């Protein structure tokens, strides 16, 4: 339920010599901070409204840690070239996800730490925060290194300690934004294709967050083994939108129902085709 | 606060 994440990305680029580091931090699936090297004056910016209050002694704090990460990836990126015998001066990507999950009780539930290289998985910190999982043979090099160097301890001390301690604080303020939501505004549309056949598309606009569900049905019976559904798309206004469709014989429109399920809704939205 | 990776690189 209550989780904090940090997605990091370092991307090598042709001739540029220096990679582009981008650190994005999430709180309950909601971005609240972001760092980017390319920026005019590279540093952490508050991506959320409730972060504006944080003192400068915190922004000069993070950016200094970000600058530190940036170099770590820079070095780690050169090491990989060796492992895979990739040549220098080229585009390669190294990503990292890390954060902590909390249960109903605001004690730590699970810790997260995993690296990826070139899209693929590389090495990950297991659920016990003691051992490592190595994807390909190269990662077994990194693991052996991190084993004999006692790397796990450092990450566990964070996930459990500092990580959690700060998520609480981010929830002492976030619990005034990540609670309010916008509701869907569904409406079926009628489109004709092929002789004696029409597609009925059930739209749903203006909802937040993106998590939602659309259902078609025949005479009341659940239908999904035949429907066409498109992934949730961002409206671009802070809200999202989605729709599903069905192909049905002409003159049989009113037979179908379209129920819409969303968080910020008191009760499912049953819809039908109008004149 | 974000994570500050272990000194040991990849």
């Amino acid at each position, epitope marked *: 339920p209550h989780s904090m994440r940090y997605f990091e990305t370092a991307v090598s680029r042709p001739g540029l010599e220096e990679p582009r580091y981008i650190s994005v931090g999430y709180v309950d699936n909601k971005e609240f901070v972001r760092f980017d090297s390319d920026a005019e004056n590279p540093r952490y910016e508050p991506r959320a409204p409730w972060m504006e209050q944080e003192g400068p002694e915190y922004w000069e704090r993070e950016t200094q840690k970000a600058k530190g990460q940036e170099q770590w990836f820079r070095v780690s990126l050169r090491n990989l070239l060796g492992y895979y015998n990739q040549s220098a001066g080229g585009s390669h990507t190294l990503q990292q996800m890390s954060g902590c999950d909390l249960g109903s009780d605001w004690r730590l539930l699970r810790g997260y730490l995993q690296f990826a290289y070139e899209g693929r998985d590389y090495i990950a910190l297991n659920e016990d925060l003691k051992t490592w999982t190595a994807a390909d043979m190269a990662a077994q090099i990194t693991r052996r290194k991190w084993e004999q160097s*006692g790397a796990a301890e450092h990450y566990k001390a964070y996930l459990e300690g500092e990580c959690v301690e700060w998520l609480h604080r981010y929830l002492k303020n976030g619990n005034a934004t990540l609670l309010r939501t916008d509701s869907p505004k569904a409406h079926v549309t009628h489109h004709p294709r092929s002789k004696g056949e029409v597609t009925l598309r059930c739209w749903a606009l203006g909802f937040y967050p993106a998590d939602i569900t659309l259902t078609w049905q025949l005479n009341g019976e659940e239908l999904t083994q035949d429907m066409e559904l498109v992934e949730t798309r961002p409206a671009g206004d802070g809200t999202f939108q989605k729709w599903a469709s069905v192909v049905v014989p002409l003159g049989k429109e009113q037979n179908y129902t379209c129920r819409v399920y969303h968080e910020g809704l008191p009760e499912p939205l049953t819809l039908r085709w109008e004149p | 606060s974000s994570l500050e990776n272990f000194r040991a690189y990849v």
Partner: T-cell receptor
Amino acid sequence: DMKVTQMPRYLIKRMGENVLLECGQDMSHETMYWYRQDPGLGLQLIYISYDVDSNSEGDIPKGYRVSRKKREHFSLILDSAKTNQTSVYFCASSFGREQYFGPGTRLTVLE
Amino acid sequence: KTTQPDSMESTEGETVHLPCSHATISGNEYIYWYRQVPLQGPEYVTHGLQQNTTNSMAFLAIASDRKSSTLILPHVSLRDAAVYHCILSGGSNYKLTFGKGTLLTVTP
């Protein structure tokens, strides 16, 4: 297995001259160090290279400059030697665990 | 930072104790122990975060809830005479600052 070496072990030079101490590991550790310690005090950090052209000051940067063009090597430069810069110099390297120190270079800067 | 006694007397056989008071510890920071025999340069002995690590040579014992620690040297010999340093090294930092440690003399 884990050896770090520094050439010119001993070196005497007249004040104002160009001093160049070298240090090699042949194990390609990402990070290397330059320390000095006088019979008086103990170890103080001069420079630390995290990797090739990535070098950062330290505690006693004034009077020294460094050059990291290969992981294996790490050279210490004294443009204008100074009498008080007559300490003992230690090079080191690490990969994440502890630091692996060299044998030490004894530099006497005579007037 | 840390703090250690300047000197420390011992004899050929006795098992030595080397204190190292170190409160105000980030807990994100490890504790390393280096030995520097005169002439030579510092070499690594052991390190630990919590619990109680150990090596083929010495035993490291970190006090409960940090704030202090102690290095144990078993049946010591002459060659075990030097200056033992107790440094705090952050898990994300290659820099470690040497004090002047503890000059351990071992009488035969």
